[PDB]
Amino acid sequence: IPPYNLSTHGDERWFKLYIKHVVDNNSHIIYSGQLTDTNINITLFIPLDDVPLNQDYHAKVYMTFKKSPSDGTWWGPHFVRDDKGIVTINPKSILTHFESVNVLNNISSEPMDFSGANSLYFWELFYYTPMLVAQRLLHEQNFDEANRWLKYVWSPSGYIVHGQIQNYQWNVRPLLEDTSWNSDPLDSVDPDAVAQHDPMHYKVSTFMRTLDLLIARGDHAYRQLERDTLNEAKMWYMQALHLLGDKPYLPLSTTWSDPRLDRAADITTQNAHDSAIVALRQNITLTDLFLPQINEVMMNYWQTLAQRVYNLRHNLSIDGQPLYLP
Amino acid sequence: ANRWLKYVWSPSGYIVHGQIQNYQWNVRPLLEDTSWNSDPLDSVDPDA
Amino acid sequence: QYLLIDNQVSAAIKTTRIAEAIASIQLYVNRALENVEENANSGVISRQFFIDWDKYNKRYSTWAGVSQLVYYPENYIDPTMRIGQTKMMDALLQSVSQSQLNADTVEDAFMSYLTSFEQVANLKVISAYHDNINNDQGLTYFIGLSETDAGEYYWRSVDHSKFNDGKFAANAWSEWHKIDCPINPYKSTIRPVIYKSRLYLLWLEQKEITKTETDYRYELKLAHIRYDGTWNTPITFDVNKKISELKLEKNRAPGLYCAGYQGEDTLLVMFYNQQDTLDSYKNASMQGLYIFADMASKDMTPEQSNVYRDNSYQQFDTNNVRRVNNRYAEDYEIPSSVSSRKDYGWGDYYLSMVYNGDIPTINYKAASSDLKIYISP
Amino acid sequence: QSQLNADTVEDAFMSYLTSFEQVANLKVISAYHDNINNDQGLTYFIGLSETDAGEYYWRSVDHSKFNDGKFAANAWSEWHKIDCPINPYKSTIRPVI
Amino acid sequence: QYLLIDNQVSAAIKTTRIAEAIASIQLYVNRALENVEENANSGVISRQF
Amino acid sequence: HDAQQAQKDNRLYEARILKRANPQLQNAVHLAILAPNAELIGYNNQFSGRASQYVAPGTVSSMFSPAAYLTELYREARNLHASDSVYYLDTRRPDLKSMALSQQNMDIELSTLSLSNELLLESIKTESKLENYTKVMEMLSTFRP
Amino acid sequence: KTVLEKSKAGAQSRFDSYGKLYDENINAGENQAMTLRASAAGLTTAVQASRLAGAAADLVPNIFGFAGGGSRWGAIAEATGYVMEFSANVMNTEADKISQSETYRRRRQEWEIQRNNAEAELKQIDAQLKSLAVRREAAVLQKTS
Amino acid sequence: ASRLAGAAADLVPNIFGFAGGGSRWGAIAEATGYVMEFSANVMNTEADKISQSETYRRRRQEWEIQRNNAEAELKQIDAQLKSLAVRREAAVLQKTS
Amino acid sequence: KTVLEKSKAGAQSRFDSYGKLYDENINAGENQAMTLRASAAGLTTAVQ
Amino acid sequence: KLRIIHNGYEGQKRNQCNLMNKYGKLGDKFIVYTSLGVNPNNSSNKLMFYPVYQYSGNTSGLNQGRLLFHRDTTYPSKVEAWIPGAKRSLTNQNAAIGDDYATDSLNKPDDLKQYIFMTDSKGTATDVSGPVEINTAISPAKVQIIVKAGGKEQTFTADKDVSIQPSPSFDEMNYQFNALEIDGSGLNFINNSASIDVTFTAFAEDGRKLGYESFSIPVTLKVSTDNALTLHHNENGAQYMQ
Amino acid sequence: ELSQFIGKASNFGQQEYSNNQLITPVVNSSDGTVKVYRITREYTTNAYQMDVELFPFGGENYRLDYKFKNFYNASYLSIKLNDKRELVRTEGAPQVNIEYSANITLNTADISQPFEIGLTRVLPSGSWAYAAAKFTVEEYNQYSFLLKLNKAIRLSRATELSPTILEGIVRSVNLQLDINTDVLGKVFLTKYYMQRYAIHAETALILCNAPISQRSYDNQPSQFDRLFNTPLLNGQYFSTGD
Q: Which of A121, H23, J177, K15 has CA 20 to 30 A from H46's CA?
């Protein structure tokens, strides 16, 4: 799909791909999406039937968009399957709505789909299974195995295959690729449904588990209270800090005006808010809105580590008591 | 526990298919107040 | 109660102004919802905010919890167990629930999980039924099979309303479920159907009987899902005559046509001699029966048979392709009666109202290009 | 058990409901009146679950509890299971006293 | 997180020179492996050690 | 139903932008979470820089603060009774519309009783058309009935 | 004073440990064990359906030709017998479920008693520290004398 | 797996000649029934295992508390020994007086 | 006196908790578990 | 099938590549800065700018050219690229979150191929150096597959071997080769095994290496002359494998 | 600490009073220079009735912002400078918790010395509600500002005295806001008295011949109010006067 150009595509970024003259002669949706600033590479499986419904072409694919939402004669690819099973594009085709169209004649198969019918089972095999195991190992204090089991999902140090580091940290394909696995998580109150919808949350969950592991290892070593297990604890706390990185900077003053309750509660502002959201979705008084909040769980991890490091630096026990008698 | 009592009775009534209905008792015979015995004084039994 | 603030409280008790306002409003709302106070606005009460009053909106901490849940689900997700996890996952969780966790314990538990994974992953789809009239409405039920002799059957389903981009959403799909029933179908002559809004399976079985010369007897079995997820016993219907009447070849199964019918509250079952293509079934003689909710069984007459055929043969399996049967209907699915109101309201001054009336009978005409509905309200 | 979460309770309910259906749909096959006259005494009934080689059940109604054209709720007993290997031809079975 | 020897540690805490050198290097290694400290050699970290 | 779906979709859109924009995730870095700026810029242009204004729990300004809770409760609760009713929320407690969602209202504790007296005392001053609270007390001293 | 402080610490440790156990009444493991017993009991209805199907199938003639029959006349009775044996095992399974749950309840009650004992010790000790402080002041005055 | 295999074998006619058949028509139902009964026994076994593991966990927790109680006693006693040493010094001074 | 008062409160808590347990004796769960064992044993005649 | 990707290495390289993909074309030339430091006296933070200079022409006409950059903070600010040698500055008022650019008032490469100081006066005070000129254009004549097969070596070039004109896209290109005839004779079979090693590699028009990917296709040789393994059972009860 | 020394400020180009200190970088149009403005606020009358804030634009122009905490049914609002010049006038009663503003010009002559902005809510009855705040507006060359800040930070760090205490010491010692040995002498006595008598620094300042402070801070009343107005006697606020 070519990059968006308002002057050629219209005000809205809306577009769709359609398939025609396969099975029937109706126009069916094969792909929907938005027109982006860069081009878009879309791979589709184009089915073919036993007998073509058109001699010049066996399948039609076309793209429509806001400025030009309609189909037309000879618009889009018109695919032809020869007797050797090789598919090409009929020269009569108008391909000005595409950046590029090519037939993948050597592809007889496709990658396993984590958004499909068997997604449930693949998501348990690659994500939930090892996260469950890792959580159990941590509870039982088998730290080395808990680490192994989190690594199967994510490694901040990457993975080595045949003695070479591969270019990724996430070992779970749908997280690495950001594949959505829901349609509407707001139908019920279920934290997992939300994560299924937006995979980002599973990445964060894995990260939180890694921090839990490191802190727990730290505390274990710490509690042994020997010169060197305290040094070990520090090491483990530093790894947790490396993962959290920089503590966020917050403003001294926000745009918040301590507005009157009657104004804050005025549904007019809420209507205006919602209207702006729709305009944003469609590519088309709000200073009294409430602000987004920092995930306090992270604040607690930042605080926990700061206290642990403090206690080590000041020669205190895990409980903050002197390790030195007065 | 709240949910399970509400299936019998709700002081705030019930919203059914999007509309508040004109009843507080969700048990048809209590709402109707239909008797279900013939003579409880033949025995010692609070249920009767 | 009127001012939503006390005056009988000790001076030693302190609060904040935001907290007081909150407490005040919560009391206000409760009195209105409970109709302690007269003439509250029922429109407003019916809004979702108040629907979820008792749970979530009534208290700050539960309100904050649910709103935060949407923004930070990771603070609530516990890998130990999740809503909607599979049974294989339950087995794994239990398998690693002991304190003695090390690599051997875990690896064995993992391979146990994986074994079950394969058994599910390789289920073969045998047949299906769509619980609607139209292909794009309702949901499709499927029957699959584990690869063992005398193996196990499983079922799952997909929601067509969740087909939203030329593709099904992951949410569209239900997980595979086991069928705890002694099903040993002949040449996979089996269909799921929905009848009385319930899942039933029907299948034909073959028995070899000596007459010597042997020959075969055919029987139709039916079984259905119970409310607790278990399955009932099969019910046997003697259809040997119908199978015998069809001029089937020695190595064939009759095609099994089976679908629920809203009209006549009945399950329509027909058997047929399979053809290469659907055009040949247009005038085929179908041998069927009716199955009723109480397991009554009645022979279908030739007249009835021909009618159901004319309106369904387009969906019959052929020697070249399997088809998913839809719900039987001639033209329109129209309710036989209506007792459930969709809405209502009070008359002036709340003194009287129209209420608990009905539509006890709905009849209709359906001539070409002429649909008339006859209501006797 | 003390750990009663929402799911446990709904499953417990469906167990109840499953049993409810099994009883609610019992078919009545036959009956016997333990008296000389229809007007006095009580009638016993035999029913059957609609299952393969299904269970037979019995219950009875007290005619002395019939008043003003209606049996009192008290008139009826609950269905009781018949715990034995009953297998009649064409349902040729009667309760007798 | 550069010199790998702390400067906020109270005077009350003692160690040996070998132990400190070990701790210093271990922190260094973690940072390289975790890519805290970018442009680490693509070899080395891929070795058995 | 489509109108309800629109709210759910609007919330998913907004939440995704606010979630990905969060400095916490961006500081962790290793998460590799994309917060595409085209959507963030559009959002901030419509909400005056709001997506970047993340706040600590405990501020009145937080969307999960009790002030946010109060705002939602008031917005819906105020419509439970007719505006001309004796049970109208602003009739009973007009100071609610007046009160601001200030950080100080959230953090400073004061006698509940003093708030109660404040309400009654102002109500009496108003009804009796008196200049101040000391005129109310002077008046009460001779109010034999 | 030092001795009493060490005593206080002892009570504090007990308090916190019993507090934690009291709050963490059922462990995940304990919950799963109870869940499993309930699940096993739940197989009763499935078992009955299978046994009935078995018995009914067994009443069907098996042998055909110039001799035949071979049906199992006692098939129903045997299946009936198995259902009852299964039911007995179920009753014991549920009884263990219930007993196990109550065992944990009673255990928790013991923890509450121990928690409260520790709490009382902390309060007594704090009171002892205060009487000691008073005694100390008297010693200081005696020094002054 | 073994029960399913058994049932499959049992559905095959076993008797041949001028009479025949003899297959077990109920073979599938029996196999299903035995698997479920076994499963119940397994669930109970697994539950017992879990209970046993948790019992040990709880046991350990009690031991930790008792360890800690003893620790407190040691600390109090050492503090008491210091108190006594002071008392002894005072007694020595009284002797000096 | 304060120390003794705290001691008194401690003893009072123990007294009341053990009293309550003693008086309750068997709770509902305990009765159901025992009822089930009894019912299972009672199947002997039906089995025969 | 050879696949060339220009998305870039995680880090400033990714940021620079994203700018090249969003603001340019496959045939473009860019100045890529390689050393992005933090100015010790002007920075308020640990953030930095990630600039790329795009020249006008080279298939994408621009007025003079653009200085593209990525910025991580989100508050609006004016971004100034000041150059101490050139005595020049390019700016972007109220620069965008993420990617934005300053217009080059004069395309004079000498002023760009030198140290640049970037700041928005609030932070991200970045020291920019090590500029290298990068030609992103690629001819199929430089897209090659090298096949090593024991004593044999063969090479293939997309220019003659690829049947479908490669896409002109920047992010990714895919080259589908016709069956290549590889002489298997010459394979060195050791322990009845040999392998054909295929390396996918390519170069840019300016000689820049585009990297490589290596595949290996093992071949097992069936030895028809070895006797079948057998199992023997000696009359004295001794069993062995022959 | 940052807030206590420099005021609140953010990357949105927004400034806010910390305690009662407002500091802004005023950029002079067409000069490019920066004058740092430091505005100190004290309430003189009835602080509980209203918030009053003054923001420079420069050129003797200021934004006067205000919000009322209570309601009196004024027929009009009149804001006056030193009770002589009406700065702001509007008809109708102002509403509670509504922020209102006006652009005003102050004479250099007023700016250079402490001055009072009084706000009177005048009822149709002829009676009125009243509150007031004292403002002092200081201007610094940005370099002078930074040097003074540096001294204040280092001194506070060395002594642990709050900037409000330190300012009180400096004002007590000299008319100009400078640090010298007399100031350090009082810093010693202030600390000494705190240590010697177990007293709060504000008390120690009084013992160093400081005035009672009318400046509030943090979540605290001014020293003046803590001392004279914690409860009000029969609702009457105590204020200074003739």
A: A121
